[PDB]
Structures are given as C-alpha cells and as structure tokens.
Amino acid sequence: LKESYLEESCSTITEGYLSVLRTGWYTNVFTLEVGDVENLTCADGPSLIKTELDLTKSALRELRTVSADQLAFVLGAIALGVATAAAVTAGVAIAKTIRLESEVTAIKNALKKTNEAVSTLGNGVRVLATAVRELKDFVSKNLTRAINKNKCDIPDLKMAVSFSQFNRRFLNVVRQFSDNAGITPAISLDLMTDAELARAVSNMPTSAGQIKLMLENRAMVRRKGFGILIGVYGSSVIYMVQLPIFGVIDTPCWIVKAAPSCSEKKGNYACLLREDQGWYCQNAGSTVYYPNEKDCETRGDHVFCDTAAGINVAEQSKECNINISTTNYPCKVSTGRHPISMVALSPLGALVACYKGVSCSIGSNRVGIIKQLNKGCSYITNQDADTVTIDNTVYQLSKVEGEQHVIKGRPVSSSFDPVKFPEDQFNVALDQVFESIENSQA
C-alpha cells in the first residue's frame, strides 16, 4: 500500500487498493414444491410425525400473510442510505414484474425436471429458474406409502427424522421470512447452498476474471445479497434473490481522511476541515466518489464499493489532494471557530488533531505508555505505536503493513487571520472561504 500524509491540509490519503464495483443485479428465482400435504391429516392421536407435519402446515399457512410491499450542498446527507433504497426499489420492481399468474404458470411448465431452466419476462430479464425437489421426492417415494388411514404414529422414527432434516430447510427459510417481513438483510447459508451459488455465479453474464473473483470471494457476496418472497402457487413456494454483479475490477482506489487544522494566536482560533473524505475509484477514465462509509467495505487489498450511492466527479479533484495551495479545482471544506477532537483513522495508521482542553498520548501493548503527543495536527503509524489515547478514550491501530510518505508544507490555516475569519460554514469551497475573508476585510 501507499500512504501519503499532507501537512498543509491536515489530511491523509491511502492508495494502492484494488477495485471491486458492485454494478449489476442478477435476479434469481427459486421454487420448492411440497405437494398434497393439505390433504394429508393426522387423526390417530399425538405423534412426532403429527407435530412436525403440523409445523410444516402452520409455516406454509403463515407464509401467505407476507405478500410483499406493505404486505399487499451536503453530499453526505444527499447520498445517505440511498443505495439501500435504490436496491430495494429495484427488488420490489422486479418482484412486481415476476408476480403474475401467467408468468408463474409459464415458469412452472418451463422448469419441469431440468433444474436450471432460464427464461424471460414480459419486458425481458434473465431469471435462471430453478426448482429444488428433494422433499417432493421424499413425500412421493416414502411418505404417501407410509401414511395409511391417517395413522401418523408409525414405529419407524427414521422416516420422522429424515422428514425433519428435509423440512428443516423450508422451516428455516420461512422463519427468516417471518422475522424480516419479506425483506431479508442478508443471505443465510440455508437460502444459498454452495453448489447453487456456484451455479448462479457461473451463469452470471460477465467476463472470465469477473467470474473468477465472483468465485473465490463468495462469502461476502452472500453477505451482500438479499432475498424477497414472491408467493405460493399450487403446491409450490416461489421466492427470488438478488445477486450482486461485480463489473469493474482491478483499478486503483484511494481513501482520503482529514481533521480540522486550527490556526491559534492569542486565544484566537480558526479551524478548517476537508469535507471530501471517503472513497474514490476510477472506471473508464471517469472518477467515482463514495462519500458514505456503509456503502463500501475493505477486504484484504481489495475494496468493495457500490456504484448506486456513488457520484461522478472529474480528475482535477485529485490535484487538490496534492497542490491545494495552487489548485484550480475548488474542492469543499468547512470553517469553524472551535476545535473538535474527532480522531482520524487511516486504514494503515491514524491521525489526531486534539487541541487545548484535552490530553493525548500513545501506548504499546508490550511496554505501556510510550510518549505524550504535542498539540497540533499529529500523524502516527502502526510501526511507531500500537494505540492512541485521548483523555480516557483508547483507539487501536491495525497491523496492515505498507509504505508511507509525508509531504512537508505550511498549513493553510496559518495563512488566515482568526480576527477576520468569517462565520461558521458547512460545505463551502476553499476559494469561497478566501473570498469571504477578502469581503469581510474589505
């Protein structure tokens, strides 16, 4: 990795990561059929078979109540949580597309006994129809012949325990769907077996290395996905699931963090904060900015950002991470009369810009408190120290190794006078701050 610490804006930039951009959504429809259990009844008294059959009956009956929908500039705040909203909007839209009686009858006659039976919709979307039929095979070969004149208290408990381990999948999936009201936050191991997930991955329409990265990083792909109920038709329960489609792979990405620099003289403060912290990635020559943190996640040397919440910017923004003094691009900052002891956390190291009022120092696990921190915009690396302590709050540093560089520069806070410093502002460009200073002095 590469870490660069800019003194003149009190910022850190971390580059050298590798891109994974979640861009597409693959709709995947599953069905599981149960049979004529509605005409199967236990009337010979209590039994384990009777209780598990009643559990299956109650589960499939309460599954019907869930019927989808309602059961039948500040860049950070603008994009706050919009990716999840867009994802669930696309999910409920494609769910409304596939919740048609002609469509489900067509998909049932199309699937027959061929497992993957890929089909199309009215507007036309790949869906990858798949049925799982192990419980139908069990009930057709064993259970109907086992039941006779509603005698469910048979001596063969092997049939009972095999029915338990078979219907545990259906009971599990309906229990997540009851717990999450049809909108699951993630994918459990019961919704996707590894073979089914691999089959869905191999049929995802994308290139070779895209499929490779889909394969060896499947666990948090399962974390990213989510499944939506469709309904019960005939004896078949049909649901779907959205799989992420990673389209943009192996591009450098960087993350920028900052803390306010406060010029101080004679009890006079002037603090400035860069407001463009977050992720930046490249694709097809264009720059995509992710200001939120929940949308994007690191793993190893790779990053996983969502293009739905991202915004499109130009290349010149990079030049205000290097040459903020002489830049033409007016990238955003914020102004203040008071310092804030908010701590910056680089992926490799850390930064603390604590000021008068609190105490700051560093510590190591093996030895103890190493040294105190002088007041100012201070940077620290995991090589020099293990933990950073401000007053009574302790923060840990990750031990991911890399190489670092510090750009020497006079802080841009010191070029202004706190006397002529303007009122507090939110998300205004640095040239706007300079011209506000010029207007207030004039």
């Epitope: 891109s19 790949r126 329409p205 994308t206 990265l213 389209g247 943009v248 591009t251």
Partner: antibody
C-alpha cells in the same frame, strides 16, 4: 487517443520474442486491455485479455500456456512474451483498449496500427 | 471455424437497404448480453462501428442501424455512398472462456 506498438518481423518457428506496446492515455490503470490478431486473408481472432494490474488474465484455448502477458502502469507500457510457435501464427497484432459499458461487457475501441509477425520457415 | 456465422455474400447498388444477419446459439448470445460490431476498411486500422446494438458513438452517420432479438442480430445500411466499402465483424462472450468474433463479411458497392 493514438497508440503505437512494435516488436515483430521475420521469425523462425519456435523462438520466443517480445512485443512491447506503448499506449499513451490520460490515465492508464483504469482500463482493461486486450490483444487481438489478424491473419492475412482470414478473419480476426481474439488473443488475450489482461485487466488493470497483473492478476486476472486469460487466453484463448488455441494459445493457452504458450503466451505471457504483463503491463507496467508506472512506465505506461504493455508487454507480451510469445513462445513455442507453430507456423500458422503469422498475423498482424493489435493492442486494444477496453472502454467498458454499464456492466462487465466491454468493446474494443481506439485500436493500434498493428505489428506484423511471420512464423513459418 | 468461427462459431458466429454470417453470410459473406452481400453487395449491390448504391442507396437501397442491405441487411446483415449474425446468428449464434444460446450459449453464444442468449439474452444476458449483447453483440458489438466492427468495421474494417483495408489500408487502415479497424474501428468500432456499433456497440450495445444501438449506441452510435461520435463520428458515425445515422445511416447505420442495428438490432438484436432472440439469438439473431440484424444490420440495416441505407444510402450507400461508395466510401463505405469494408469488412464487418461481430463479437460475443460464449461461456467457453473465450471472446469469439464472427466469420467476417465483405461489403462492396457496384
């Protein structure tokens, strides 16, 4: 955006040569890149795909194993080692950029002039 | 030996419509993705002529129209001024881990 490459000529069957490609874009590491070939009098045929930095490559089945691909983003250069030849590889080679769409699909565009390579005898 | 098949036997008078048919199989095209077409005049490096089956880039006249449907892709060319004499090629992403092109088709104007 223009681009150039060189490294071919009259080559006996079997030996390994280097094809160096010197594309000069605005910024380099964003683009997947590809090599394609043009046999004289036949149709075009895809040779190789390489993504941004050196980890996810693939080849055509006819040229699997016999070809090595790499790229230096710092030098802004592209490198191919070509080895273990048989005579039907006589063709003109093209470096192509990978300006992608809204998905994993991409189309070749802004093609190079090409470099001619002869293999037989 | 290209799996993408298209007839290399098209020519005619200037002005009228000429149609190119490019057809594969379900693994070739299907409905997941698309076909991109490239033109190649002799004496110069070939350039892309249409991508995403409709998106004309900068520097191409609107005489060129393309479509895809089912597994079959159709080119319609009208207003043949003599300079549009070239070879035409398809591309596809069939799942045999290979980026297969088409068979190539010559187009000349009498």
């Amino acid at each position: 955006v223009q681009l150039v490459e060189s490294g071919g000529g009259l080559v006996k069957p079997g030996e390994s040569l280097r094809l160096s490609c010197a594309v000069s874009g605005s910024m380099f590491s964003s683009y997947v890149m590809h090599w394609v070939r043009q046999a004289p009098g036949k149709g075009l045929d895809w040779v190789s795909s390489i993504t941004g930095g050196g980890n996810y490559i693939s080849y055509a089945d006819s040229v699997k194993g016999r070809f090595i691909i790499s790229r230096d983003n710092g030098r802004n250069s592209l490198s191919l080692q070509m080895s273990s030849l048989r005579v039907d590889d006589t063709a003109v080679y093209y470096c192509v950029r990978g300006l992608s769409g809204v998905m994993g699909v991409t189309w070749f565009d802004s093609w190079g002039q090409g470099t001619l390579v002869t293999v037989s005898s | 030996q290209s799996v993408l098949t298209q007839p290399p036997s098209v020519s005619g008078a200037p002005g009228q419509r000429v149609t190119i048919s490019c057809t594969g199989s379900s693994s070739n095209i299907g409905a997941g993705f698309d076909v991109h077409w490239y033109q190649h005049l002799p004496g110069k490096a070939p350039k892309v002529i249409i991508y995403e089956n409709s998106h004309r880039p900068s520097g191409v006249p609107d005489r060129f129209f393309g479509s895809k449907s089912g597994t079959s892709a159709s080119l319609s060319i009208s207003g043949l001024q003599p300079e549009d004499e070239a070879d035409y090629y398809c591309q596809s992403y069939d799942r045999g881990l290979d980026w297969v092109f088409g068979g190539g088709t010559k187009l000349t104007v009498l």
